[PDB]
Amino acid sequence: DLASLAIYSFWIFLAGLIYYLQTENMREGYPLENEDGTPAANQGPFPLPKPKTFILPHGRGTLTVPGPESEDRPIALARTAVSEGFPHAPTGDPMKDGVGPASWVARRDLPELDGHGHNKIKPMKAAAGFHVSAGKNPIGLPVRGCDLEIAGKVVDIWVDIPEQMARFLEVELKDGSTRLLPMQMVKVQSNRVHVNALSSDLFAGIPTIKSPTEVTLLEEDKICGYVAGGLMYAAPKR
Amino acid sequence: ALLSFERKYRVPGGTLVGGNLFDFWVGPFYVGFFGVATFFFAALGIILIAWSAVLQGTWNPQLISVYPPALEYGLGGAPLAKGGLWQIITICATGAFVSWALREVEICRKLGIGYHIPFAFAFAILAYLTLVLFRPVMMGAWGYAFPYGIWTHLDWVSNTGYTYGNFHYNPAHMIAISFFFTNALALALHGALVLSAANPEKGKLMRTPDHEDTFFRDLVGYSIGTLGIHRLGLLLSLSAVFFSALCMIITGTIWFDQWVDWWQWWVKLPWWANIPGGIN
Amino acid sequence: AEYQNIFSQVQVRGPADLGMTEDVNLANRSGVGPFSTLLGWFGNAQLGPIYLGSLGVLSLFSGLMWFFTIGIWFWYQAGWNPAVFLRDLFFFSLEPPAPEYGLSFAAPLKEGGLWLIASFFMFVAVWSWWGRTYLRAQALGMGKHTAWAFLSAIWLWMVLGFIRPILMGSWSEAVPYGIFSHLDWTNNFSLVHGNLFYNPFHGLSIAFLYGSALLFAMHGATILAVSRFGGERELEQIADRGTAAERAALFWRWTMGFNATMEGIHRWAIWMAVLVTLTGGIGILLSGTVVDNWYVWGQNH
Ligand code: BCL
Ligand code: BCL
Ligand code: BCL
Ligand code: BCL
Ligand SMILES: CC[C@H]1c2cc3[nH]c4c(c3C)C(=O)[C@H](C(=O)OC)c4c3nc(cc4[nH]c(cc(n2)[C@@H]1C)c(C(C)=O)c4C)[C@@H](C)[C@@H]3CCC(=O)OC/C=C(\C)CCC[C@H](C)CCC[C@H](C)CCCC(C)C
Ligand SMILES: CC[C@H]1c2cc3[nH]c4c(c3C)C(=O)[C@H](C(=O)OC)c4c3nc(cc4[nH]c(cc(n2)[C@@H]1C)c(C(C)=O)c4C)[C@@H](C)[C@@H]3CCC(=O)OC/C=C(\C)CCC[C@H](C)CCC[C@H](C)CCCC(C)C
Ligand SMILES: COC(C)(C)C/C=C/C(C)=C/C=C/C(C)=C/C=C/C(C)=C\C=C\C=C(C)\C=C\C=C(/C)CC/C=C(\C)CCC=C(C)C
Ligand SMILES: [Fe+3]
């Protein structure tokens, strides 16, 4: 009867939707590979989707996915066993080499742009009309490391203009040079700013930016990745 | 077996128990001590459900159904065929759910991310434990809990609801339903937004989070923001479950009469309690 | 304790954002309302501006007419007494015309005409608002997703009070405007049709409703767990995958064997929810028109 026709036609529809949705989610990462980087034998039941192209605004070109996948960087890792599935060990300084929880991606070395083509994240000193309208103002506060030692001070807040939001804290170090700490990894307290992920002696390590008034997608990733890897790698000092 | 960008993430460490013993993967699945723990609890539980299948005399999934001890057994143990199985399976289900959560924690430590996922899962873990553990124990018998059956458990809902009349009247149930309905409206929107942006009319350029925020200000005069909608989504959810667990812990313990009558406290307020007219 | 990113630690405010222009008629946009320090801790602080427009006003008007029309009736039943009104606010009700009147607009005001009045206003209010959510997106040059997903909700709404009552032969099958009374209507609709738990669409509806709540928890929690890598900036993470979208993807692959993309997860999100009122609409349409009892049906199919 009509009802029986309806529910069946639906489970058919639902299986095509699961098919559709699953392939759409295979635009990145695929095709799979073996630990050695060569294409794997079994790719699953689902096939790669037909390429779609994004036309990025502000003449930044286009993006096609799925497309040729490459890390475009060296991986300082080595196998720990003679078969598949086991951890790969860092051959150098995981933090410096950028592996594990300290991994970063080789995103474009350009800064993200707002609707009108202007840099998304600007330090607040060059951001017109922006000020701290609530909560404690970090600027001027000493920054402490997971080892309870002072690593520097906050000299400015980098903000996201279109969304009016704190994204970074520019910190000056003992040697007069600055670095950015992701807002999300710091705890602004009454008389200081505590950073649990890193220890004092590691702040100098944080990757630096090339221009003093902007951050590039790449640079953000390196910084964030570095600060996060500290959680696991700093530990012997925290 | 790996995603084009996976290897660099597969490093050692992060485990909570057993150092490097179980620190390894099987296909895409990460293992870990807890990877093991849930396989044990899961299999043992499945076995027991299968065994309770033979004691009932059936292999149809739509008929199998593991019932709890009868209200006569109180909060004590019972014979396998009359509630003893449900009690052990319940022990096994909780062992799997918890383990699974802890497993996600070790997967976070390895990826260096936040513990928001396993934290949000603990909220469903709570809902379940309210139904099969806290409510029974406060009422005094494993029998108030629900059966593990595809339809038999729906009955339990239907019977447990109508015990207090039209459950619609439970105030915490009304609050919980709101969060659910909202949470869906919200997810429906956030997904259509991000997509109407990345997938603009044919030919044009990908829009920017600026057009998103814009779009909503024009529509309703406000935009919560990309970091806000994700906080909201996480919040509408966990809340809908919080109030759900709450609406049940109070039903059959601090209130056991028809729910619709609970609303009299409002209508029987001295001020208007006697004024004539209206509906009351 | 580390920072969880649920509430901001320091707010920052700049010049009011007038938004993108594109092909929008800037003559219809109002002026930036105030800034809320409250909402700031959670989301954006800026209220407004909002776009009015002809469709915006037609809707907003119908909308209040519908709301006032019901209320005129509630006050009526309260004998215009302020204390009663407040006391029984939950029990009042604007019921539809009686069965006798069938599908006619002849029924007297005091017995369903006033209901028909209201519904008309609500019918205009809704659809016009749909149109609005379509045009606003066109002005900005974005996809029509929001408009389409809204239709799904309209679907169930439409079935419950218009589509089904037309296929039955009377406005008496529609829902009454009342808080408690529309709850009572729901309970009845189940009993009369042999317990809706036997309705397979209703069963599926609940699946997605629960699913939507599962998914957002998942998605939300995820984007916040990798916010420390700029995860919330989904769109640029779409065009230029960052460590944020990779770790995100890998947490779920390692956990449950498979994962999504920064753009794909939204395609899941958009459907998961949309199907709730999609299947739910069907389920209610086939109740009383084709299937009289879902238990009986459940026995034969
Ligand atoms: C789907 C099956 C049933 C149904 C079953 C239920 C059930 C079951 C419950 C509700 C409840 C509600 N239903 Mg209903 N409801 C149906 C159809 C409707 C129709 C319309 C169809 O086209 C509407 C608008 C409503 C509207 C509502 C809300 C007034 C209320 C839920 C709050 C909420 O979060 O809403 C989602 C919407 C938003 C978040 C956005 C807009 C916000 C709204 C306007 C806020 C209303 C607040 C309310 C007036 C608070 C009063 C408290 C004061 C202290 C006095 N229902 C259908 C027919 N409805 C709940 C309740 O608590 O009822 C008493 C409840 O338990
Ligand atoms: C006729 C019956 C009554 C009624 C009786 C009840 C009763 C009785 C209860 C509810 C509950 C609920 N009701 Mg009701 N309800 C009625 C009408 C309604 C209406 C409506 C529009 O009419 C609505 C929207 C609701 C809505 C709701 C929800 C708010 C709530 C259930 C969600 C929940 O707790 O999830 C929580 C989630 C869980 C408990 C699941 C936990 C999942 C676990 C952690 C993991 C499992 C993993 C699995 C084993 C793994 C499989 C792995 C494989 C590889 C796949 N009810 C009627 C009037 N309702 C329930 C509630 O509040 O519960 C606390 C409840 O007990
Ligand atoms: C919340 C209040 C009631 C309740 C009320 C209802 C009501 C009312 C309905 C359901 C329905 C369902 N419920 Mg229930 N349910 C409860 C508690 C549970 C628990 C638990 C561990 O406590 C579990 C596993 C389930 C599971 C289920 C599903 C089988 C089915 C919904 C599909 C869905 O989309 O789900 C949401 C989850 C997802 C989309 C995620 C994917 C998970 C999959 C679907 C899990 C499959 C589990 C499989 C059937 C069990 C395998 C066990 C083996 C040992 C491995 N319920 C409580 C006690 N449930 C619906 C149905 O169609 O029933 C016949 C329905 O209408
Ligand atoms: C005792 C009664 C029956 C029962 C009877 C029904 C009936 C009858 C119906 C449902 C429906 C639903 N039931 Mg039930 N249901 C029962 C038990 C349950 C249980 C449970 C755990 O026991 C659960 C989880 C559910 C769950 C559900 C949902 C999946 C579904 C509604 C989806 C929705 O979002 O609607 C809400 C969404 C809408 C109403 C959309 C339309 C909204 C419009 C467009 C907006 C108007 C806005 C207004 C003009 C503006 C207001 C805002 C201003 C700012 C003021 N039911 C019991 C067994 N259920 C509905 C369905 O679709 O079923 C198939 C339905 O008709
Ligand atoms: C805010 C709470 C919301 C939520 C969140 C949530 N769920 C989650 C997570 C989160 C954050 C996960 O990380 C986790 C996940 O991995 O998702 C992909 C998960 C998950 N949510 C799940 C289910 C689920 N969530 C639900 C709900 C919700 N989840 C809420 C809406 C429901 C409903 C609505 O009922 C269900 C069924 C699982 C698919 C998955 C966790 C998987 C897991 O723990 O797996 C290992 C466990 C086993 C192998 C257990 C078997 C145990 C026993 C041996 C047998 C079965 C016993 C059981 C009593 C039978 C019941 C039969 C029914 C017919 C009655
Ligand atoms: C999968 C389907 C889910 C869904 C989706 C959904 N809803 C949507 C959309 C989508 C995709 C929209 O795009 C649309 C929207 O605009 O969202 C922001 C909307 C929407 N979903 C709404 C409601 C809603 N959705 C619900 C459910 C759901 N929506 C599902 C869960 C429910 C429930 C659970 O019952 C409700 C009540 C509306 C708020 C909104 C569409 C607005 C509309 O139709 O408006 C007509 C206008 C009026 C009725 C105006 C009068 C309002 C009041 C009566 C008066 C008081 C307020 C007024 C502002 C006072 C003015 C005073 C003066 C002095 C100034
Ligand atoms: C403080 O006092 C004042 C005066 C300010 C006013 C106060 C107002 C109050 C207190 C209002 C209270 C109203 C409430 C609580 C209303 C609740 C409604 C609810 C809970 C549910 C509504 C369900 C309705 C749905 C199912 C309705 C669907 C309607 C349609 C699909 C349209 C129907 C169309 C018809 C009859 C035909 C019209 C003509 C055509 C063909 C175009
Ligand atoms: Fe998102």
PDB file of C-alpha atoms in Angstrom, chain A residues 38-176:
ATOM      1  CA  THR A  38      52.830   4.713  -2.089  1.00  0.00           C
ATOM      2  CA  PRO A  39      49.136   4.250  -2.967  1.00  0.00           C
ATOM      3  CA  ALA A  40      47.463   1.546  -0.864  1.00  0.00           C
ATOM      4  CA  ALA A  41      45.977  -1.556  -2.459  1.00  0.00           C
ATOM      5  CA  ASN A  42      42.532  -1.358  -0.810  1.00  0.00           C
ATOM      6  CA  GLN A  43      40.799   2.029  -1.121  1.00  0.00           C
ATOM      7  CA  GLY A  44      37.399   0.976   0.222  1.00  0.00           C
ATOM      8  CA  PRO A  45      33.994   0.536  -1.524  1.00  0.00           C
ATOM      9  CA  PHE A  46      33.544   4.242  -2.325  1.00  0.00           C
ATOM     10  CA  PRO A  47      35.209   5.928  -5.355  1.00  0.00           C
ATOM     11  CA  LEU A  48      36.874   9.350  -5.492  1.00  0.00           C
ATOM     12  CA  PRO A  49      34.462  12.187  -6.334  1.00  0.00           C
ATOM     13  CA  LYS A  50      34.513  14.225  -9.524  1.00  0.00           C
ATOM     14  CA  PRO A  51      36.782  17.325  -9.073  1.00  0.00           C
ATOM     15  CA  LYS A  52      35.100  20.593  -8.019  1.00  0.00           C
ATOM     16  CA  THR A  53      36.719  23.996  -8.256  1.00  0.00           C
ATOM     17  CA  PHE A  54      36.580  26.853  -5.794  1.00  0.00           C
ATOM     18  CA  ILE A  55      37.269  30.334  -7.154  1.00  0.00           C
ATOM     19  CA  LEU A  56      38.884  32.077  -4.194  1.00  0.00           C
ATOM     20  CA  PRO A  57      38.106  35.788  -3.799  1.00  0.00           C
ATOM     21  CA  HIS A  58      40.615  38.608  -4.126  1.00  0.00           C
ATOM     22  CA  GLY A  59      42.162  37.033  -7.214  1.00  0.00           C
ATOM     23  CA  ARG A  60      43.954  34.427  -5.093  1.00  0.00           C
ATOM     24  CA  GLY A  61      43.354  31.871  -7.814  1.00  0.00           C
ATOM     25  CA  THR A  62      41.515  28.580  -7.515  1.00  0.00           C
ATOM     26  CA  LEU A  63      41.491  25.275  -5.636  1.00  0.00           C
ATOM     27  CA  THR A  64      40.566  21.911  -7.069  1.00  0.00           C
ATOM     28  CA  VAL A  65      39.686  18.893  -4.947  1.00  0.00           C
ATOM     29  CA  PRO A  66      40.346  16.142  -4.911  1.00  0.00           C
ATOM     30  CA  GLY A  67      43.818  16.950  -6.234  1.00  0.00           C
ATOM     31  CA  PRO A  68      47.562  16.034  -6.022  1.00  0.00           C
ATOM     32  CA  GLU A  69      48.441  15.494  -2.329  1.00  0.00           C
ATOM     33  CA  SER A  70      51.895  16.388  -1.054  1.00  0.00           C
ATOM     34  CA  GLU A  71      53.233  17.454   2.351  1.00  0.00           C
ATOM     35  CA  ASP A  72      55.602  19.891   0.618  1.00  0.00           C
ATOM     36  CA  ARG A  73      57.947  19.494   3.576  1.00  0.00           C
ATOM     37  CA  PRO A  74      60.294  16.979   5.232  1.00  0.00           C
ATOM     38  CA  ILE A  75      59.083  14.524   7.870  1.00  0.00           C
ATOM     39  CA  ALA A  76      61.732  13.802  10.502  1.00  0.00           C
ATOM     40  CA  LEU A  77      60.316  10.420  11.534  1.00  0.00           C
ATOM     41  CA  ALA A  78      61.443   6.784  11.447  1.00  0.00           C
ATOM     42  CA  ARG A  79      59.630   3.458  11.860  1.00  0.00           C
ATOM     43  CA  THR A  80      59.757   1.673  15.228  1.00  0.00           C
ATOM     44  CA  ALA A  81      58.626  -1.777  14.045  1.00  0.00           C
ATOM     45  CA  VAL A  82      58.856  -4.075  11.011  1.00  0.00           C
ATOM     46  CA  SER A  83      55.160  -4.083  10.237  1.00  0.00           C
ATOM     47  CA  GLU A  84      52.289  -1.627   9.839  1.00  0.00           C
ATOM     48  CA  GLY A  85      50.403   0.253  12.508  1.00  0.00           C
ATOM     49  CA  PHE A  86      53.127   1.229  14.910  1.00  0.00           C
ATOM     50  CA  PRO A  87      54.202   4.675  16.104  1.00  0.00           C
ATOM     51  CA  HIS A  88      56.905   6.499  14.137  1.00  0.00           C
ATOM     52  CA  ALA A  89      59.579   8.138  16.258  1.00  0.00           C
ATOM     53  CA  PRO A  90      60.948  11.683  15.854  1.00  0.00           C
ATOM     54  CA  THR A  91      64.543  11.548  14.661  1.00  0.00           C
ATOM     55  CA  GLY A  92      65.252  15.093  15.831  1.00  0.00           C
ATOM     56  CA  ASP A  93      63.544  17.662  18.058  1.00  0.00           C
ATOM     57  CA  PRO A  94      59.851  16.967  17.485  1.00  0.00           C
ATOM     58  CA  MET A  95      59.143  20.602  18.437  1.00  0.00           C
ATOM     59  CA  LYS A  96      61.707  22.048  16.001  1.00  0.00           C
ATOM     60  CA  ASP A  97      61.036  19.477  13.249  1.00  0.00           C
ATOM     61  CA  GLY A  98      57.294  19.958  13.497  1.00  0.00           C
ATOM     62  CA  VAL A  99      55.919  16.471  14.123  1.00  0.00           C
ATOM     63  CA  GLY A 100      53.305  14.793  16.292  1.00  0.00           C
ATOM     64  CA  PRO A 101      51.266  17.258  18.418  1.00  0.00           C
ATOM     65  CA  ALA A 102      53.664  19.925  17.113  1.00  0.00           C
ATOM     66  CA  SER A 103      52.738  19.330  13.464  1.00  0.00           C
ATOM     67  CA  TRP A 104      51.930  22.212  11.182  1.00  0.00           C
ATOM     68  CA  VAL A 105      50.696  22.329   7.631  1.00  0.00           C
ATOM     69  CA  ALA A 106      52.241  24.093   4.642  1.00  0.00           C
ATOM     70  CA  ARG A 107      49.348  26.437   4.029  1.00  0.00           C
ATOM     71  CA  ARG A 108      49.826  29.418   1.733  1.00  0.00           C
ATOM     72  CA  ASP A 109      52.348  31.950   3.007  1.00  0.00           C
ATOM     73  CA  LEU A 110      49.777  34.756   2.699  1.00  0.00           C
ATOM     74  CA  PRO A 111      47.583  36.278   5.426  1.00  0.00           C
ATOM     75  CA  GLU A 112      43.808  35.690   5.468  1.00  0.00           C
ATOM     76  CA  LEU A 113      41.712  38.522   3.995  1.00  0.00           C
ATOM     77  CA  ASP A 114      38.369  39.979   5.080  1.00  0.00           C
ATOM     78  CA  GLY A 115      35.393  40.736   2.870  1.00  0.00           C
ATOM     79  CA  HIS A 116      37.031  43.854   1.465  1.00  0.00           C
ATOM     80  CA  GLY A 117      40.502  42.417   0.910  1.00  0.00           C
ATOM     81  CA  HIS A 118      42.129  43.798   4.059  1.00  0.00           C
ATOM     82  CA  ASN A 119      44.308  41.707   6.422  1.00  0.00           C
ATOM     83  CA  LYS A 120      42.085  39.764   8.818  1.00  0.00           C
ATOM     84  CA  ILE A 121      44.339  39.774  11.843  1.00  0.00           C
ATOM     85  CA  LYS A 122      46.090  43.035  12.672  1.00  0.00           C
ATOM     86  CA  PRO A 123      47.969  44.011  15.780  1.00  0.00           C
ATOM     87  CA  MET A 124      45.726  46.345  17.808  1.00  0.00           C
ATOM     88  CA  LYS A 125      48.202  49.235  17.595  1.00  0.00           C
ATOM     89  CA  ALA A 126      47.430  49.538  13.895  1.00  0.00           C
ATOM     90  CA  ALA A 127      43.717  48.688  14.234  1.00  0.00           C
ATOM     91  CA  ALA A 128      41.568  51.844  14.155  1.00  0.00           C
ATOM     92  CA  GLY A 129      38.876  52.195  16.798  1.00  0.00           C
ATOM     93  CA  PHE A 130      39.589  48.943  18.610  1.00  0.00           C
ATOM     94  CA  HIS A 131      40.126  48.758  22.356  1.00  0.00           C
ATOM     95  CA  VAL A 132      39.546  46.340  25.222  1.00  0.00           C
ATOM     96  CA  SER A 133      35.850  46.711  26.137  1.00  0.00           C
ATOM     97  CA  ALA A 134      35.493  44.009  28.781  1.00  0.00           C
ATOM     98  CA  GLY A 135      37.475  41.737  31.028  1.00  0.00           C
ATOM     99  CA  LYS A 136      41.067  42.233  32.132  1.00  0.00           C
ATOM    100  CA  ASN A 137      43.432  43.834  29.639  1.00  0.00           C
ATOM    101  CA  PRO A 138      46.451  41.522  29.143  1.00  0.00           C
ATOM    102  CA  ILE A 139      48.697  44.223  27.672  1.00  0.00           C
ATOM    103  CA  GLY A 140      51.448  45.023  30.117  1.00  0.00           C
ATOM    104  CA  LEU A 141      51.171  41.739  31.984  1.00  0.00           C
ATOM    105  CA  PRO A 142      54.189  39.439  32.483  1.00  0.00           C
ATOM    106  CA  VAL A 143      53.889  36.006  30.907  1.00  0.00           C
ATOM    107  CA  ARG A 144      54.739  32.906  32.927  1.00  0.00           C
ATOM    108  CA  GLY A 145      55.623  29.464  31.623  1.00  0.00           C
ATOM    109  CA  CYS A 146      54.575  26.022  32.765  1.00  0.00           C
ATOM    110  CA  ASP A 147      57.759  26.118  34.871  1.00  0.00           C
ATOM    111  CA  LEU A 148      56.512  29.146  36.816  1.00  0.00           C
ATOM    112  CA  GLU A 149      59.282  31.355  35.425  1.00  0.00           C
ATOM    113  CA  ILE A 150      58.726  34.694  33.620  1.00  0.00           C
ATOM    114  CA  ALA A 151      59.384  34.500  29.879  1.00  0.00           C
ATOM    115  CA  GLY A 152      58.381  37.956  28.703  1.00  0.00           C
ATOM    116  CA  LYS A 153      55.553  40.480  28.680  1.00  0.00           C
ATOM    117  CA  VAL A 154      52.490  41.299  26.620  1.00  0.00           C
ATOM    118  CA  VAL A 155      53.011  44.363  24.453  1.00  0.00           C
ATOM    119  CA  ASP A 156      49.886  44.128  22.319  1.00  0.00           C
ATOM    120  CA  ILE A 157      46.791  42.144  21.309  1.00  0.00           C
ATOM    121  CA  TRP A 158      46.458  40.977  17.722  1.00  0.00           C
ATOM    122  CA  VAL A 159      42.814  41.062  16.712  1.00  0.00           C
ATOM    123  CA  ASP A 160      40.437  39.679  14.112  1.00  0.00           C
ATOM    124  CA  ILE A 161      38.756  42.720  12.636  1.00  0.00           C
ATOM    125  CA  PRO A 162      35.602  41.396  10.870  1.00  0.00           C
ATOM    126  CA  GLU A 163      34.669  39.278  13.886  1.00  0.00           C
ATOM    127  CA  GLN A 164      36.104  41.600  16.542  1.00  0.00           C
ATOM    128  CA  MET A 165      37.885  38.917  18.554  1.00  0.00           C
ATOM    129  CA  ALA A 166      41.191  38.421  20.352  1.00  0.00           C
ATOM    130  CA  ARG A 167      43.324  35.875  18.470  1.00  0.00           C
ATOM    131  CA  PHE A 168      46.934  36.425  19.597  1.00  0.00           C
ATOM    132  CA  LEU A 169      49.018  38.038  22.313  1.00  0.00           C
ATOM    133  CA  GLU A 170      52.252  39.633  21.052  1.00  0.00           C
ATOM    134  CA  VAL A 171      54.912  38.936  23.669  1.00  0.00           C
ATOM    135  CA  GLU A 172      58.298  40.570  24.050  1.00  0.00           C
ATOM    136  CA  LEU A 173      61.156  38.365  25.241  1.00  0.00           C
ATOM    137  CA  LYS A 174      64.260  38.969  27.366  1.00  0.00           C
ATOM    138  CA  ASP A 175      66.141  39.786  24.140  1.00  0.00           C
ATOM    139  CA  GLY A 176      63.673  42.425  22.923  1.00  0.00           C
TER     140      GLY A 176
END
